Ligand SMILES: *Cc1c(COP(=O)(O)O)cnc(C)c1O
């Protein structure tokens with residue numbers, strides 16, 4: 065009575081989180097109010113709001129000098145808000161182009177100012193992530209933006225470059241808090257919460273405070289990072305139920321053993337599915353190079369569009385949700401974020417085997 | 425075991441809505457998923473998403489030519505997005521200045537282009553709403569913006585001007601769907617949902633489609649109205665649980681007899697409290713003129729700051745939440761949105777009487 069949910073965004077939440085939030089949904093901690101009916105400047109909501117920030121940092125080793133912001137508008141709004149805040153006249157926003165979400169991010173930056181493609185995997189049809197360990201950039205680079213996990217193509221960086229005084233910025237929408245990383249490599253990371261952290265309606269932005277101490281004063285108040293830093297994301301009404309749900313997911317992540325624990329669990333999930341593809345005698349084919357494989361979104365094809373359509377419908381009828389890939393990629397996508405249980409992955413590879421043999 | 429919740433934003437939800445959403449929070453309609461774990465491009469979420477729009481229009485008499493959008497960022501983001509979309513070079517954004525939220529809206533518009541104060545109640549310290557039936561505006565007016573209910577001052581317009589070819593725009597954050605109005609008077613109305621429609625994290629924007637058929641192409645994609653119109657608010661991931669909760673509130677509003685029913689109920693609630701103030705032999709004093717009184721946010725003072733502090737603490741100890749007014753106004757504010765039951769209002773006037781006599 066739980067669907068095999070492979071949705072890519074919004075996506076699975078841990079059942080335990082759903083049950084906890086359900087239980088106190090009408091009356092939170094005997095206050096006689098739902099968390100949804102409380103003031104965002106009240107102590108009860110504020111405890112949740114602040115706890116979420118601290119837990120998030122703690123999962124990342126609690127490096128100093130970083131502020132966790134909760135901003136509305138999704139990752140797509142960050143695509144504009146980042147160059148609005150950081151792309152000064154005369155500077156160039158540099159992008160690493162690894163597929164669909166990098167392309168969206170670049171497009172927005174061009175509306176705001178000068179851009180440059182600093183690296184690209186388009187020549188491999190996004191199968192081969194670019195090597196970034198070098199990359200050359202200019203002095204007048206405003207930042208280097210990359211996408212840590214290309215949710216649609218199924219490619220994912222294992223590591224990130226040292227960019228010196230050029231701030232590194234990462235769209236980590238589809239893999240944030242799936243794996244340890246060194247936040248100090250980045251000036252800003254961001255993620256719509258709805259892939260690996262909870263509900264839609266909240267974007268987590270973690271920013272180096274020295275980079276946003278004085279935001280451009282010509283910008284709309286709600287599009288300045290300092291509005292959020294200096295007002296603790298409460299300048300206006302925050303997405304308070306969404307942040308409450310992020311806090312509950314963060315508690316769950318710690319229960320699962322933190323980022324190192326979920327990474328191990330996710331590697332196991334992913335390894336099962338990649339093995340099912342790799343041992344399929346070519347019946348299933350991974351979309352990206354082995355060394356670029358994502359552990360969050362596993363993309364693969366069959367020998368024909370007809371077979372892929374059959375896979376999608378038959379999977380849907382056996383209770384799998386969300387496996388059809390994006391049209392630009394075609395084929396299938398198994399999204400296997402933290403909360404997607406190993407059991408769903410087992411069911412999926414069992415199904416993959418049954419399908420293959422039922423076609424054999 | 426329900427608090428007497430007079431919070432001003434986020435605020436009370438109907439208990440019935442909380443109970444319905446609690447009941448299907450883990451498993452929505454036997455899908456084996458929460459509504460929160462579903463794809464926003466799936467049929468199940470889409471039914472909710474589209475239903476909410478239709479129900480909203482239906483509550484307003486279903487006038488043609490209007491699109492209901494769900495936008496993130498709160499009403500505060502609309503303060504920028506409205507002039508970004510409508511304040512063309514050479515045109516002037518005209519504002520009606522009625523207190524704190526009008527002032528916030530004007531401030532944002534000045535970042536974007538030329539503004540003008542077309543009417544103001546500042547000379548009455550915002551006690552006396554301006555008469556708008558006339559108002560003079562120029563040819564080069566981009567729009568006339570007003571605030572239908574000034575949530576902090578407790579003032580509210582009973583009616584709106586006929587502005588001809590100049591679009592009328594209304595911030596109805598704190599009174600939307602509390603009363604019938606003629607949507608055809610407006611080119612755009614908007615409201616953060618968290619005052620009278622549900623959860624925080626969603627802003628309802630209802631726009632005349634002929635006004636936004638081609639939004640300014642220099643704007644960030646997420647700050648164009650046509651992105652939302654043409655993609656049915658699903659260009660990116662929407663605040664899907666928030667929209668689900670708005671849909672549930674809209675069902676409740678219809679159950680309560682629609683806008684005409686809730687208006688009557690709210691008038692009764694409000695009348696009880698205004699009577700308690702007016703019959704108090706001056707112990708309680710309304711902040712605004714009788715003819716400008718809001719039925720959503722009732723503001724009042726006592727003879728001294730000391731008495732007001734006593735009121736606030738004693739009310740808090742008897743289980744009233746949120747009655748302390750904003751500092752700029754001082755005194756008290758009873759926020760009595762649709763979902764605040766008559767019973768809370770009864771408890772409040774009983775308390776007001778007990779307090780008064782316990783000081784007498
Ligand atoms: C889903 C996704 C986005 C878009 O997020 P929204 O909240 O829908 O704007 C951006 N980047 C990546 C990597 C994503 O996976």
Ligand SMILES: *Cc1c(COP(=O)(O)O)cnc(C)c1O
Nearest residue numbers: 300301498499500525575597616
């Ligand atoms: C609360 C309120 C706002 C601000 O809404 P946010 O969602 O917090 O940005 C704007 N206008 C009015 C009239 C309000 O009552």
